[PDB]
């Protein structure tokens, strides 16, 4: 599992988007789109803005 940190709150604005709160840790599913990254939290899989998350690499 690759992980991302929510840097800012994000409210879903379309059907395939996921809501997150600042500080949330999410599983990264796909980062090939420059603008939107696919993530996973709980039973949800969808997109958040790439600029709102940071990859958690040492």
């Amino acid at each position: 599992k690759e992980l991302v940190l929510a840097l800012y709150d994000y409210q879903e604005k379309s059907p395939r988007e996921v809501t997150m709160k600042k500080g949330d840790i999410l599983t990264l599913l796909n980062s090939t789109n420059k603008d939107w990254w696919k993530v996973e939290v709980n039973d949800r899989q969808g997109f958040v803005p790439a600029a709102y998350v940071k990859k958690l690499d040492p």
């Binding site: 800012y8 709150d9 604005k13 603008d35 939107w36 803005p49 600029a51 709102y52």
Partner: peptide, 6 residues
């Protein structure tokens, strides 16, 4: 916060 995308 940053801008959303389009």
């Amino acid at each position: 916060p940053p801008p959303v995308p389009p």
